[PDB]
């Protein structure tokens, strides 16, 4: 344990060593006693681990060949019903990624007063930018009208309904006067986390994944499928991180987790399930090979139950998973 | 993709007025853009921002990919002098928190006000890159068995480092006020001063004496693991600087009324002060010479790069010094 002479930096500000961070004073929220700019010592090892795992998942949409997809798309082989599924899913995802990434930067990051958790957030937000690039790349490859696809959430009622709900559940977190140092403020902040991690990423996105990955399984639009596989790998970590963050904030601030807040979260999850079912019905008015809307009634309920359990809430639907392969 | 558009390949609107929200390319602006929907990436207007984003994405690296065995062997040996160790430690000290300062300013100050989705795409890449740089300094500390708390706290313990970061805080301005807005001449000028403080001064000047000293070791075959990590950080920082210059010049072009003789002078004076603090930091790092490095060389170098930064944002060079380190403009193959 011996090191050469001169391997330490000498301080010349004599009071400065007091600013070294005490690991145990670190908190996920409302932490202003210690220096948020120093990463070390890392307290939340789960956050750092998610960061490292995310970094190991580097990919770019432009690495994925689209030749076979373009050839299929331009042919007469796809039914109009199949094209409808693809188009509605591209319309929803094209802007939803932006909504998620903007909320991380503009709502979440300020109030997560912890450097290792913020490291992960920076990785997550970049990953949402990659997902956006994906949708641009798909549109350009297939020769879709990119404005028509990206504007879908303003033109298609079942998509608009999901993102209008998302706006509601975002709450007042963007307001200049919003703070998390009240019980009510921190409850609102947690509802925003549930809205984006549990509902948007954890329910809305997983349902679109099934539709697209169902094509991939049939050897149709395999390039889009492969991109969605990479997106799913990322979203798995986004969800695990968000659940950890929610559970961590609960643990450190047990006064927020009232029966009232719990019921409010349950009610928002129910509303999200109903919207996602409506969206699946809009995607599948008749149903295509391997996919019918009735399967989504079961699937959306099933995943909602899994998300509820992860944040300490009772399952409510008790439906089986009709897509075991997911 | 040049084949016929097939029947049924359009998605039908069931909200008839919704088409009005498709974004007109000519309505997009870098700041104060409330006329169009910021959540839609397309159509891309600022091709330069998108190019920076694609270039950054092509530069993926991780500090953990760079072997540290030879550096550990050298650090543990008597073949590195006390003065050489001081250069390494002060630079690690400064960089370890500077990356977090830059990244936090991107997210908390810049992103809100850059009202354009392609520029925001680049910002998210840049902020992630700053996290990679932070990881790099943790990895170096752990690799060499340095006291991580000592290194990351350097900016509170060393006067020449604190002086730089205190200046940085000042030049951040009032942009963090949650009621700060860029929708006035004064507001937009303050925002542009923040961009100058972070892109031109922090990233474009304060990082450079450090890059020279560390890359000088790498050229001598000393601490080549740290050197390689600094080469990757340099490649990133070059793109960060180019983007910030492009953004400052684009904001000026779109809002020429902000670029007054008074603002121009204020910017020059900020850059002059940054030069003085950076020269003082180089003197702190180098009380005595090491091979190919002396504190006095940094007077010329820091002034030379400050002139180059000034020119790029349309201001006249003021120092006219030559570059003592012309190898720094040598294409590195990574
Ligand atoms: Fe996500
Ligand atoms: Fe940078
Ligand atoms: Mn995503
Ligand atoms: Mn950096």
Curated annotation (Swiss-Prot), chain A:
Its cofactor is Fe cation. Fe cation 2 binds at residues 128, 201, 235, 238. It catalyses: a 2'-deoxyribonucleoside 5'-diphosphate + [thioredoxin]-disulfide + H2O = a ribonucleoside 5'-diphosphate + [thioredoxin]-dithiol. Fe cation 1 binds at residues 97, 128, 131. Keywords: Deoxyribonucleotide synthesis, Iron, Metal-binding, Oxidoreductase. The active site is at 137. Its EC number is 1.17.4.1. SUPFAM superfamilies: Ferritin-like. Binds 2 iron ions per subunit. InterPro entries: Ferritin-like_SF (IPR009078), RNR-like (IPR012348), RNR_small (IPR033909), RNR_small_fam (IPR000358). GO terms for biological process: deoxyribonucleotide biosynthetic process. Gene3D superfamilies: Ribonucleotide Reductase, subunit A. GO terms for molecular function: metal ion binding; ribonucleoside-diphosphate reductase activity, thioredoxin disulfide as acceptor. It comes from the Bacteria. Tetramer of two alpha and two beta subunits. Belongs to the ribonucleoside diphosphate reductase small chain family. Provides the precursors necessary for DNA synthesis. Catalyzes the biosynthesis of deoxyribonucleotides from the corresponding ribonucleotides. This is Ribonucleoside-diphosphate reductase subunit beta. It comes from Chlamydia trachomatis serovar D (strain ATCC VR-885 / DSM 19411 / UW-3/Cx). The gene is nrdB.
